[PDB]
Design a protein around this ligand. Structure first.
Ligand SMILES: CC(=O)N[C@@H]1[C@@H](O)[C@H](O[C@@H]2O[C@@H](C)[C@@H](O)[C@@H](O)[C@@H]2O)[C@@H](CO)O[C@@H]1O
Ligand SMILES: CC(=O)N[C@@H]1[C@@H](O)[C@H](O[C@@H]2O[C@@H](C)[C@@H](O)[C@@H](O)[C@@H]2O)[C@@H](CO)O[C@@H]1O
Ligand SMILES: CC(=O)N[C@@H]1[C@@H](O)[C@H](O[C@@H]2O[C@@H](C)[C@@H](O)[C@@H](O)[C@@H]2O)[C@@H](CO)O[C@H]1O
Ligand SMILES: CC(=O)N[C@@H]1[C@@H](O)[C@H](O[C@@H]2O[C@@H](C)[C@@H](O)[C@@H](O)[C@@H]2O)[C@@H](CO)O[C@H]1O
Ligand SMILES: C[C@@H]1O[C@@H](O)[C@@H](O)[C@H](O)[C@@H]1O
Ligand SMILES: C[C@@H]1O[C@@H](O)[C@@H](O)[C@H](O)[C@@H]1O
Ligand SMILES: C[C@@H]1O[C@@H](O)[C@@H](O)[C@H](O)[C@@H]1O
Ligand SMILES: C[C@@H]1O[C@@H](O)[C@@H](O)[C@H](O)[C@@H]1O
Ligand SMILES: C[C@@H]1O[C@@H](O)[C@@H](O)[C@H](O)[C@@H]1O
Ligand SMILES: C[C@@H]1O[C@@H](O)[C@@H](O)[C@H](O)[C@@H]1O
Ligand SMILES: C[C@@H]1O[C@@H](O)[C@@H](O)[C@H](O)[C@@H]1O
Ligand SMILES: C[C@@H]1O[C@@H](O)[C@@H](O)[C@H](O)[C@@H]1O
Lengths: 314, 314
């Protein structure tokens, strides 16, 4: 009997952030509280003393950070408005200004969030789904939350993945997002600084389960080069991985590890192929002590393997 | 999708009652309200005006009836107590007495309910899971609510199916309940009016997905004879049925119909092999309009066949 694991909501939203191998993982408990687990040389926390806020039961959970100096965690209120819990080093946790804006979204909306890459400025872009079923970008550039670009129609309840990177030869940040459309395909939308939003949808998978989880990362930004990894729960009840590798494009897709039916998914990465990396970490529920969150590991030494069997508080 | 279907909670609890082919189906909308869809010659209702109460988001939903003259619907409060919405013919809906007893159960608890068969009296047995993860029976015999028999440990957050029937050569009701044990097996416990609860767990399936939905019915009671069907979501993302048939015992098991990953399941039945039945109706989510509730049908005319594609309000 595992009372810690029982505290984790079955099919909880999962988010994660890191600065290299210093890790934080956010999940919802059975009372709807959002808890933090931590890895600093070893795993710790995720107890009822480690609550950073509350949200509607079954809320999406997204997170983004600048190393571990600035963290932001996004969930839905009971009123189906976006809200934000902020960490700043030297300040600690507090309620962020997103809530005050009262952005009404679909009750079944998911959320994705990024800090724009390649600047020390605190610039945020959030993605969620309006009641008309369109994907809307919400922006912070230091003087008030505002609506950004609307990205058009999606499957109601679609998962949303997002990443920002800055090519080392470019003067500004790039954004990529992924969601599912009404034909059930999983698709990419792309922002470059000299182009804005590309007009076209690029398909990364032909038929995925409806409202499947979608999580994304990128690493190894070079001169007009990037590496990206996208993950979703396929109809075989495993997480699949779609690979973008510089010079190969979208050239591989395949299963990675079993999950529970309807598992949510989070991804973090650090390093690069050029410098004896990258490291990858996935987080999901695969049924360990029934409801615990489990970890998957990719590194250069031993490749693909299962990491922590059961995260705190399990 | 459709605006109507969007209001149905993805992976909602489902329950159903009937008097022969006069049908009622209960489900949870995205706001946490419990709604009723109706079949009287055709399908109707399931809108915001067809709400019988509110329950915590993601609550189990169970319902039992004596024909359509008395219906009881059971869910969890926000404080993880058992509650009851009652319908009596010529009284209407009201809040049933159960909530006042403040029966505290595990936040991840499911619920099953039955009116004891073969009497006129309103006798009820409710099954849910205590915080110590044991399955507890809760009784009403016309003289207040009280705890009945404890039936021991089960998987935290187990599904629970239950049925009551009366062997025609007996002056009293039998009860059968199904749930999932800590070893991930699916098991039966049994109550007969002479022997009480038999000490032994009977295995109906060797290993099922953690916290899989479990729904059961029985029909065609005779002298020392009975037929029963147990439904669950197997790892192949489909509903499986386990058959008890008089003289064959537990002799057949197999897939019936595909569902979304982690779909809930409800079953109703009427009639008998003896008289050009029985009739079966399964309710579940299969991805029709993304989040609408669909129906499967068994009858003697056509056999296994899909029924209503999308219940109201889709
Ligand atoms: C006394 C009588 O026959 N009344 C009927 C109602 O029962 C019926 O209500 C519907 O069915 C009941 C069992 C519940 O499910 C209600 O929510 C339904 O509205 C209404 C509508 O047909 O008709 C009479 O009032
Ligand atoms: C004899 C009689 O008519 N008694 C009724 C009760 O049945 C009724 O209670 C409800 O119905 C029962 C079966 C349980 O489900 C209770 O928890 C319900 O409250 C009440 C309605 O208030 O009225 C009489 O006591
Ligand atoms: C210039 C500066 O540092 N201003 C901070 C501002 O960043 C804080 O706002 C928070 O963090 C930002 C990036 C968003 O997530 C906001 O929604 C959030 O409130 C603000 C906190 O009150 O304090 C300013 O000094
Ligand atoms: C008429 C009678 O008493 N028959 C019993 C039968 O009820 C017992 O079997 C139980 O009931 C059936 C429906 C299944 O649920 C069985 O798995 C369950 O054990 C049986 C006990 O072995 O004994 C018969 O006499
Ligand atoms: C950064 C660390 O990497 C490996 O050592 C894993 O076993 C840990 O859980 C953690 O992910
Ligand atoms: C970056 C910070 O690191 C630790 O001090 C944690 O206790 C905080 O909650 C936060 O994760
Ligand atoms: C980084 C860019 O910033 C603004 O110009 C937005 O309107 C775009 O949507 C994009 O997010
Ligand atoms: C990293 C790459 O960036 C642009 O070239 C896109 O058109 C590609 O689809 C890919 O996203
Ligand atoms: C970073 C690694 O890149 C390739 O080696 C993939 O096959 C691995 O799964 C991993 O994504
Ligand atoms: C009793 C009725 O049976 C069939 O006609 C189904 O098509 C209906 O939806 C209903 O279940
Ligand atoms: C029908 C029976 O009623 C009482 O005797 C309960 O204690 C039993 O558990 C059973 O529910
Ligand atoms: C009443 C019927 O019983 C058997 O024939 C099963 O094969 C059917 O699926 C149905 O359960």
């Amino acid at each position: 009997s595992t009372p810690g694991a029982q505290q984790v909501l079955f099919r909880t939203g999962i988010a994660a952030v890191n600065s290299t191998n210093h890790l934080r993982v956010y999940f919802q408990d059975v009372y709807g509280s959002i808890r933090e687990s931590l890895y600093e040389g070893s795993w710790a926390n995720g107890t009822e003393k480690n609550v950073i806020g509350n949200a509607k039961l079954g809320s999406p959970v997204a997170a983004t950070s600048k190393e571990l100096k600035h963290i932001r965690v996004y969930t839905l209120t009971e009123g189906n408005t976006l809200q934000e819990f902020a960490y700043d080093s030297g300040t600690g946790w507090y309620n962020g200004g997103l809530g005050g804006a009262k952005f009404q979204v679909a009750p079944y909306s998911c959320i994705a969030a990024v800090f724009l890459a390649g600047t020390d400025a605190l610039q945020l872009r959030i993605y969620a789904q309006k009641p008309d079923n369109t994907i809307q970008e919400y922006m912070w550039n230091g003087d008030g939350w505002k609506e950004g670009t609307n990205l058009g129609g999606a499957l109601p309840g679609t998962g949303i993945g997002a990443t920002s990177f800055r090519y080392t030869d470019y003067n500004g940040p790039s954004i990529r997002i992924w969601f599912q459309t009404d034909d059930l395909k999983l698709v990419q939308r792309a922002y470059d600084p000299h182009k804005g939003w590309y007009p076209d949808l690029v398909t990364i998978f032909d038929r995925a389960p409806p409202r499947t989880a979608i999580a994304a990362t990128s690493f190894g930004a070079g001169n007009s080069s990037i590496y990206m990894r996208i993950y979703f729960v396929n109809s075989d009840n495993t997480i699949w991985q779609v690979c973008w590798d510089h010079g190969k494009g979208y050239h591989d897709k395949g299963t990675i590890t079993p999950v529970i039916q309807g598992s949510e998914v989070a991804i973090i990465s650090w390093g690069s192929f050029a410098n004896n990396g990258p490291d990858l970490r996935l987080y999901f529920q695969n049924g360990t002590y029934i409801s615990a969150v489990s970890e998957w590991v990719w590194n250069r030494a031993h490749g693909s393997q299962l990491g922590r069997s059961a995260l705190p508080p399990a």
